[model samples]
Target: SEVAHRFKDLGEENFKALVLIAFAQYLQQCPFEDHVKLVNEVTEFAKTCVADESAENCDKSLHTLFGDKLCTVATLRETYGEMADCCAKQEPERNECFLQHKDDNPNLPRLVRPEVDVMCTAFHDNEETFLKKYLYEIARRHPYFYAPELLFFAKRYKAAFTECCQAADKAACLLPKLDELRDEGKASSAKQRLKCASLQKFGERAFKAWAVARLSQRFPKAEFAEVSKLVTDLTKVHTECCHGDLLECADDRADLAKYICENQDSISSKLKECCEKPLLEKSHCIAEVENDEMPADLPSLAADFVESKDVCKNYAEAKDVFLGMFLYEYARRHPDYSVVLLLRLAKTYETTLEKCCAAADPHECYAKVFDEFKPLVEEPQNLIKQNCELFEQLGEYKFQNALLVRYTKKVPQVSTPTLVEVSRNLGKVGSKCCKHPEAKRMPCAEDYLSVVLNQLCVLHEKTPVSDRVTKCCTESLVNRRPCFSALEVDETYVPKEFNAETFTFHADICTLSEKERQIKKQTALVELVKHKPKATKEQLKAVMDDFAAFVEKCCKADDKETCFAEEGKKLVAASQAA
Candidate 1:
């Protein structure tokens, strides 16, 4: 009776279809008992709907039964609004509508993709459950994604599981594949959305030109012939995927990935590492290459982009592509500029478009876009120059340790291991790039710095870090490192009670390799922060400074242990004074 009351409007056949769809869409998430209850309710509702000739609306029945517990009404409207229309129709018509619209655009609830360790635990706990759960989660979260599209991703996920789950080095195999899959899924959705939006807004002919032109401006270092070819292949694949040709798009794009990899000489030297990877890894590696260098022959200053009334029309026609091209052009020209600065440039340009397009004297307003970029662009160069000067003055080991201390204090909750890796990579960027002449140093610094930031973000994927760290990591490429750099100490972390033993120095420090010494110093800093959790940064720095001086003086002394033991008291007193 309760089941009948809950589903008082849908007929038996409609109810069956609903169950099938639920199983197809949500089986992985809901319990079997819930499914049974849901099925019975729908059956009872069918009988009631038939008796009433579907007089009452059917939409409320399902929502009323599960809305409060399983999902929100807003989610239903956003994901499956068409279902309400089908529910309103009577008997045969309703069934037809359900059948027609059921798979048209299967938008499900959004979900965070599971991390590698989470997947591993779930898989190890029960392989079958892991596989089903993966599909279910992927399906529901990508609610608007189609069945085949869901399967396409799941199949690769499963394939990766098959290979990685049983590997001798499970984490080694799993990390990159999992990251690749995550990135591929993200790229696919973004590319499909942008391409489809541009296509619909501009029509095929205009969009094709826009794609090529946008690519050309973005990849100024690449030969135009290669850029056009790359865009052509990309447009075709994206168009097919956008139009809902899932399998065809996958196959064609796979082929395109292979082509790009095989033609790496002409495509990009940067793709060399990605192309060397196995087939599955190659595509993601290729997709991730950011070609930021400007052509050697091109002028340092970019020519003004806006010309006439067409500017507003073009901007209005496809704002994303137009603005994206502007951002790209500015970024490629100013390779040394930080992503933070580039983001600022994009914002500046967008606002310029907004005000200038509406002005009585539009051209006068539009002419200011380049002039605005000039000062903003110059600041990033100055920042890079200043950074390089410091790197030179402090030298490698000192610079690396200083960065480690700063980064550790910024996000103290980050694991010491990952933090060490980030600091080392950061210092490598300075050491390798700062040695270059000014003209080349800017792009070199930007290139290496971006890689270090990317690695930092990726390293924390499985590690549980603070909210501040997570937020900083998740920011877009250009913004992420700066986000990290600007982060203040995590005050929420109450470091453990002081332990002097944790800071006690040993003679092993004197014998370690240079690389190991740098790591040991970083480890010491982490311990210092933990033991003296409440110490002011200045006091901490002073303590560290005294400790470093002691190490330098004692490491070579005749009575090494005595020097360390005697000087160690000063370090402890300094730490306690804070």
Candidate 2:
């Protein structure tokens, strides 16, 4: 409605339009016929509000018409009240004000999703109404997603619900679809943010090229022309979509999905799962699919692949096209690598050319870039193995705190809050994966830790730190964690004075939780590392073992202080030894 009952001068027609607008925004699935009826019902209720000047009848009427299932009574009232504020404005501005108004309540309170049986029964009872409720739930949860994106998800859910609900084993058919929807939503949202950020940092030209390369990698078997056509379509979709044109972008993207669905045979066999989906969901499903391997006929990009001496000249001639070719060739060759990894590789190559092309001996300067890239290629496995080994030896509690101490010492300028957040997530990665079977641990840790590290780089792209930290953050996603691994301890930091109290333990230590005991050991080890800065890692390990033994021996001893005093002296001597 243009204005609610509060605006007496705005008249009944405007009030009814306001109610219609409310239905459109909140209950997006309402049919046109239902819209007319619902608006009239709500408008009549508004008259009763003026007659009585009380909110009770107004609230009850909205609940009766819309029901509490689709949009809650609270949400309906909240939305109506928000729209009511715009009534104070003049003509076109009133509607414009209403359209521009954002939801003040950014987060919904924690609400458990209905069980599968409950959802299915509701779906069967009133399929359309249930879908409205589903859309409202999704819309509130993903507050950042635009109407088109939300509708796309709702479309997918509707199709999945119809098929899965009719099956003999309903949950078996439905559960995975729910998981797929949830994951795809999360991933797509992140990807959009990443794309927008890249656009801001790298500009539209480089971003478009990266898009082409990424899409090409997704369907490596597609003919070059087909990949080009698809990339062009997606580039168009992204240019508008990433810049805030959600509705038109969705329409264009739906067409892009039609193209992929119709030509699935040529794109890649991996698209089969996505192609079976309906239009909008087909687009979403296609977006979620992982990259396909390079076709056997396609050759890998050669080392020293660029034959030109005037590299900058070639790059300047067609920046977007040139970068797109580089990304496409490099990406096709390394189909299993992450998009960020490939972007970093492209970045390294670009910067190398930018510098070398101006040198007197450009050939000599640029020839070794590939060699420079070799270390990054090998570091992923090494990083994973070493971190997992620590997790195995130290256990999760100490492993996490060890990471905290390690990174804290490495980048001392980093804010304590930021360091703690990074350590907590990194610690979670180890805690989660280290408990898996030995065969699964390495791969599990690798996958989970990569996401955390990737997010760290993207999320903290502009955070100022030491030069070493900045260098790693700026490029080389493959080498970022490795780069962090190699940072030196902050030499400027001075440790707290080492004394008897540093390693002292009470009898209460023996009765503490396993977690508490681990924390106790970690605290002492942190001090030990600070105390003996010159000590070898092996020496520190020995001191840690000795201190743990001393805690156990002393905590239960008849004379706790004398036992701690003697053994603590021995531990200090062990740590302090050259």
Candidate 3:
């Protein structure tokens, strides 16, 4: 039938001879007799051609059987030696009512499609030459498209369709960019050949990884092991069929996607039937959802996910496909997982990010899994801004905390409960001062502490001639230390012996006697070492090397919290023991 269609213009009798030769050469699937029988039938048709005016029909079949260019008897006589005598050692004079096209390749595969004629067929003389010629056409057309990127698409197209030029037309825009890169030295030639040549399994492994990963999704997972051989076969075919022609589809993976997206339904049907094959066979039969729609290279996937979270729930296999993509980069898989796993997982769950972080525009999801959804460390300072109650709580802590720092110095041995109570006392006194006529001038917490501990705040000396003048020092465990600005003070400056062991650096009446400051630092070092076991050897040596200096700087290291107050109790014990 095809022969009848292609050879309709061939000279009457020669048309039948061409079909006979073509059938004997190509359609000889049966016994030799059958091809011989075919020749006999066309001979019968040749006899009837002159009698029945079937010359056009006979000519039609001739080109179909021989090839598109077999039109004139003289031409056929010249080219097909076997057909020459049959048509006559005829001259162009016999070419009347004859038709023949000039261009032709006797070497081209007899059965190539009309479209196949679009490419150079000089290469058709040898399959390799044909492919090389086809590939060069690809390189020429897409010189601006990088040979490698085009290689991927072209190879994929060829692999899938058994054609060489897959994407040069689509990637037309990309070639200039590709061409600009290939220099006079043909610096890009090796890669160009690697991409455009039919032999290479370029991007084979990675593309397989990307493909199987996706099939593992839409197809039944249970079918994978049974279908993996299917994966292997498809992969091998892709490598083979797509070798040089891949770049044809290189310009747009989306174009490839649209290809499969269009074919998705049909492939699903194929996949189901493929599953019925024997286990090993099934692997080679299942459907392939094509393209790099699944991995580390899917730039659009993430963008779409951002556009709508539905992709999250929709892409059931997205997570796995995503992680597996890491295996391939620059076309070779590096591991079972790529370097972008964390980034991939983040993008996977990014849908929840803004919902969890919208207002604050937080830094957790893209950086964290879940724990980092919020700051791992609290920003209580931020809390103060958002929560009104924090203001009052902070004020209280400011009152309590600062007082604690000061009190430890005044009554360094005061128990925790007492210290807490004393802090409460400062708040109480401060509040009472607020009720004073000078209520408008509320004293700060330290002012409250100073007023209650040493003397009334200057604010307490209300302008309406308030009576209070001097503040009396009070008694604690072993001493009395006080300030001026309250009601009164006792007789001259005599501090009761704080069991003579009690100490306070407060009060105008006293301070640590100079030796107390110095000798105390030695004992301080002993306690300091015990609490800070990690203290460096050099650090301990520093304190030991200069005791007086250590005390000046750090009885508490100039910080209430870091005090070495009882730091040298061990020194007292050792010295006493000694």
Candidate 4:
């Protein structure tokens, strides 16, 4: 219905022109019709509109029917002639002329009446050319009319023609230069291109350049030359066969295109590898270390290996080497993982050398091993420092302190006395030197003496105090007591070992009273109270009373008569003394 209205408004003379312009516009918003059907429709419309027409009237009608400078009967006739020539000769050059002619024709005034015959002849003459030229002109004038397929075709043609010309020119220039290069041998300016023989090489280069340019249009900042080189290298083997230099193509052009799509990962990996090396090296150099075997050094090496693996063109072999380096570096830096990684790497190295590097020479094997482990061993002191920190955090101080003491004692050169032993020994001396005076306080005199004596014994026995020093210590302890011979057995026996067996009888005898005991009992108590020069009368009396009480308690029976007999003897003795 829209097409019918468009035809009615344009009138008889301009019907074909309106249809052509409208169809061109329609193509933008619709699907393409069959070429033959389109040609028949245009022909039928031309017959009905331009029968028995005059040339000037037809031209005026053409201008009136279509928009100003849009199309004309005369230009349509010329276009039809070119289309006929193209069909007959298999070549047509109507692109520029058809577009120019359509633009040159002026619009007719609204009052002009045009002849039908002239318009019919012009409209019927150039159907094929009109279709192509009209559609393309619409696209050029209004880009919204440009279908993707037409744009694609236009771009392809432009690229193919441009690339072919470039290939020809490059071949013309490069071939002669390559010949000159061959004559000059190693000193040639054209040596790079000399590797590629014949014009086909230049053609391939041209194709790659064009493709890279197109890709660059899409990814504006990407390195076009690098992408071109990658594509060229990847397809070189198959491209050679397609150029007829080889017996058969290993892969078709479509296959090569598919390969490019599938292998973007490889390209990205290669690109990253090529880019990250300098960054890794800069980081590694700034890291501090005194020795080569430190753990800090291993991370730098592992990072380098990872970067190298990413960049490696030979991916599988590089990946294996990367894994080896990672394991070795981890083992070298961490104490817990050190043995584990070492063992793992050792096994890996064995297997890898056997499986992948068996054919390699001794130098290569050594290089492989060095590559895997050299970075990890870059600083030994860092490893030691790390292990020290870990040991401290784990509360392994006692074991470490003891080891340090023994090591210092043995090595002398590298070892020094640790704080652990100093603190322990100082604590013992502090406990011994402090004592309590009161018996009923929280820590009584006996408790205080026991604690002090225990500390003194620890200091003397466990530490490096001499025998003369220990004797002096004992004398000092004895001097702390007041009138030792008169003291009770519990107070006198400061050392528990002194009261165990042999000293218990003497201790019991010293607990008697002088008034209650007989002369024999008093003399026995006095004899028990031995000193270097002999004890005084008061000291002897105190000892005798203690002995008498001990004998009364140990010798008397539990019966009432026996207890009374003991008590009566003591009472009579006291009366006689009074």
The candidate that wins on TM-score is: 2
lDDT of 1 by residue, 325-411 (tens): 565555556544544466666777788889888989887777766677778667557767887887888888667767777777677
Best-fitting candidate, scored by lDDT: 2
Q: For model 1, what is the C-alpha lDDT against the true structure?
A: 0.59
Models sorted by lDDT, best on top: 2, 1, 3, 4
Rate residue 35 of model 3 by lDDT: 39
lDDT of 2 at 74: 26
lDDT for residue 388 in candidate 4, whole number 0-100: 41
**Candidate 4 lDDT over residue span 324-374, tens digit each:** 334333333433222212333344444544454334343334346536544
RMSD of each: 13.6, 12.0, 38.2, 47.4
| Per-prediction TM-score to the true structure, in the order listed | 0.48, 0.55, 0.17, 0.16
> TM-score of predicted model 2?
0.55
Model 3, span 1-578: residue lDDT tens: 33333224334333333333333222222223443455556556555554555455654433232222222322334333444333342333222112121111122322332343343243234543343333333333222223323333333333323333344552353334333433311322222222222122224544455445434433332233433544555455444223221212121232333333344443344344544443322322332221222233424333343344443343445544433332222112111121122223333354454354443433333333334423411232132223223324546433444343334333333333334444444544433333333211221222233323422211122221222221222221001112221223222222222111222121211246553443343333333333233223445444444445434444434455343344333333322222
State each model's CA lDDT, in order: 0.59, 0.61, 0.33, 0.32
What TM-score does prediction 3 earn? Answer: 0.17
**Of the candidates numbered 2 and 3, which has the greater lDDT value?**
2
Instruction: Write the number of the candidate with greater lDDT, choosing between 1 and 4.
Output: 1
Candidate 4's C-alpha runs over 4 A off are 1-81, 90-207, 210-260, 268-578
Runs of candidate 3 with Cα error greater than 4 angstroms are: 1-205, 217-222, 241-267, 270-578
Model 1 root mean square deviation, Cα atoms:
13.6
Off by over 4 Å in 1: 1-304, 324-344, 354-361, 413-415, 454-465, 488-497, 505-514, 530-578
| lDDT tens per residue, model 2, 55-86 | 56453423233332223332344444554445
* Range of the 10 consecutive residues with the lowest summed lDDT in candidate 1: 66-75
